[PDB]
Design an enzyme around this catalytic site. Structure first.
Site, PDB file in Angstrom:
ATOM      1  N   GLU A  35       0.616  -1.234  -0.034  1.00 43.13           N
ATOM      2  CA  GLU A  35       0.155  -0.116   0.183  1.00 43.13           C
ATOM      3  C   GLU A  35       0.757   1.299   0.115  1.00 43.13           C
ATOM      4  O   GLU A  35       0.552   2.222  -0.722  1.00 43.13           O
ATOM      5  CB  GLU A  35      -0.889  -0.042   1.144  1.00 43.13           C
ATOM      6  CG  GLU A  35      -2.258  -0.888   1.097  1.00 43.13           C
ATOM      7  CD  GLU A  35      -3.161  -0.642  -0.193  1.00 43.13           C
ATOM      8  OE1 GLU A  35      -2.944   0.652  -0.743  1.00 43.13           O
ATOM      9  OE2 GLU A  35      -3.857  -1.643  -0.418  1.00 43.13           O
ATOM     10  N   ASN A  46      -7.485   8.994  -5.560  1.00 40.03           N
ATOM     11  CA  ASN A  46      -8.130   8.223  -6.525  1.00 40.03           C
ATOM     12  C   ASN A  46      -8.898   8.834  -7.674  1.00 40.03           C
ATOM     13  O   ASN A  46      -9.199  10.135  -7.579  1.00 40.03           O
ATOM     14  CB  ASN A  46      -9.091   7.333  -5.784  1.00 40.03           C
ATOM     15  CG  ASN A  46      -8.497   6.560  -4.564  1.00 40.03           C
ATOM     16  OD1 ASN A  46      -8.827   6.718  -3.544  1.00 40.03           O
ATOM     17  ND2 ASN A  46      -7.547   5.769  -4.860  1.00 40.03           N
ATOM     18  N   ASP A  48     -12.124   9.004  -8.336  1.00 43.73           N
ATOM     19  CA  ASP A  48     -13.132   9.392  -7.940  1.00 43.73           C
ATOM     20  C   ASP A  48     -12.992  10.730  -7.182  1.00 43.73           C
ATOM     21  O   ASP A  48     -13.796  11.436  -6.785  1.00 43.73           O
ATOM     22  CB  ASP A  48     -14.020   8.532  -7.269  1.00 43.73           C
ATOM     23  CG  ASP A  48     -13.440   8.169  -6.068  1.00 43.73           C
ATOM     24  OD1 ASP A  48     -12.378   8.358  -5.288  1.00 43.73           O
ATOM     25  OD2 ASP A  48     -13.987   7.541  -4.971  1.00 43.73           O
ATOM     26  N   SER A  50     -11.323  10.871  -4.161  1.00 44.92           N
ATOM     27  CA  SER A  50     -11.081  10.552  -2.923  1.00 44.92           C
ATOM     28  C   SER A  50      -9.513  10.486  -2.825  1.00 44.92           C
ATOM     29  O   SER A  50      -8.699  10.298  -3.958  1.00 44.92           O
ATOM     30  CB  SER A  50     -11.678   9.225  -2.626  1.00 44.92           C
ATOM     31  OG  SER A  50     -11.343   8.344  -3.255  1.00 44.92           O
ATOM     32  N   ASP A  52      -6.168   8.357  -0.892  1.00 47.00           N
ATOM     33  CA  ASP A  52      -5.706   7.243   0.219  1.00 47.00           C
ATOM     34  C   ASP A  52      -4.529   7.783   0.872  1.00 47.00           C
ATOM     35  O   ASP A  52      -3.593   8.518   0.626  1.00 47.00           O
ATOM     36  CB  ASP A  52      -5.360   5.623  -0.525  1.00 47.00           C
ATOM     37  CG  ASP A  52      -6.463   5.532  -1.358  1.00 47.00           C
ATOM     38  OD1 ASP A  52      -7.634   5.548  -0.988  1.00 47.00           O
ATOM     39  OD2 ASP A  52      -6.016   5.194  -2.451  1.00 47.00           O
ATOM     40  N   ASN A  59      -8.807   5.426   2.774  1.00 46.81           N
ATOM     41  CA  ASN A  59      -9.548   6.166   1.894  1.00 46.81           C
ATOM     42  C   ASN A  59     -10.616   7.337   2.410  1.00 46.81           C
ATOM     43  O   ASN A  59     -11.075   6.747   3.271  1.00 46.81           O
ATOM     44  CB  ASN A  59     -10.418   5.458   0.744  1.00 46.81           C
ATOM     45  CG  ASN A  59     -10.741   5.839  -0.531  1.00 46.81           C
ATOM     46  OD1 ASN A  59     -11.978   6.170  -0.523  1.00 46.81           O
ATOM     47  ND2 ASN A  59     -10.095   6.299  -1.359  1.00 46.81           N
ATOM     48  N   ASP A 101     -15.734  -4.467   8.901  1.00 45.19           N
ATOM     49  CA  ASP A 101     -16.850  -3.995   8.021  1.00 45.19           C
ATOM     50  C   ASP A 101     -17.615  -4.852   6.862  1.00 45.19           C
ATOM     51  O   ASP A 101     -18.651  -4.712   6.574  1.00 45.19           O
ATOM     52  CB  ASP A 101     -16.385  -2.758   7.088  1.00 45.19           C
ATOM     53  CG  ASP A 101     -17.414  -1.769   6.407  1.00 45.19           C
ATOM     54  OD1 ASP A 101     -17.984  -1.287   7.327  1.00 45.19           O
ATOM     55  OD2 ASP A 101     -17.309  -1.672   5.183  1.00 45.19           O
TER      56      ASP A 101
HETATM   57 CL    CL Z   1      -8.800   0.771   2.911  1.00 43.45          CL
END
Ligand code: CL
Ligand code: CL
Ligand code: CL
Ligand code: CL
Ligand code: CL
Ligand code: CL
Ligand code: CL
Ligand code: NA
Ligand code: XE
Ligand code: XE
Length: 129
Positions: A35, A46, A48, A50, A52, A59, A101
């Site tokens: 990552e 990103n 979109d 957003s 990270d 995100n 989640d």
């Molecule tokens: Cl994530």
């Protein structure tokens, strides 16, 4: 801060990530490797809009507030900047929410694509812990 592999493993362990929701420490270390290359300051935008953030590339669409991700949530109730600290506590706490989640570590695309199913223990091999 750019962690060493064993140093990050230790930190993650201390913060209760080893076996959190069943994911052994190597999973988290591997995820962090791919990552962010263990860099707490890693950021990536990103498509979109957003972004990270941090060693686990959390995100802003869902998890943190960066003030520039319209319609976003902030489910970890944190500024995304908190995720860039040399202290990994906020990243870890948010990661714990994420991984609880429902899709587990598949939330982390690098984990799914580069770590999942691999010998993740290699990432903590030789570390004191
Ligand atoms: Cl994530
Ligand atoms: Cl490494
Ligand atoms: Cl492991
Ligand atoms: Cl804001
Ligand atoms: Cl926002
Ligand atoms: Cl929210
Ligand atoms: Cl799971
Ligand atoms: Na957000
Ligand atoms: Xe970025
Ligand atoms: Xe982390």
């Amino acid at each position: 801060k750019v962690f060493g592999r064993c140093e990050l493993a230790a930190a993650m362990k201390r913060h209760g990530l080893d076996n959190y929701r069943g994911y052994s420490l190597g999973n988290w270390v591997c995820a962090a490797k791919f990552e962010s290359n263990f860099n707490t300051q890693a950021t990536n935008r990103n498509t979109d809009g957003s972004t990270d953030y941090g060693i686990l590339q959390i995100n802003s669409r869902w998890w943190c507030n960066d003030g520039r991700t319209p319609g976003s949530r902030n489910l970890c109730n944190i500024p995304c900047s908190a995720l860039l600290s040399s202290d990994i506590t906020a990243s870890v706490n948010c990661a714990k929410k994420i991984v609880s989640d429902g899709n587990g570590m598949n939330a982390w695309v690098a984990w799914r694509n580069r770590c999942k199913g691999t010998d993740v223990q290699a990432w903590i091999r030789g570390c004191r812990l």
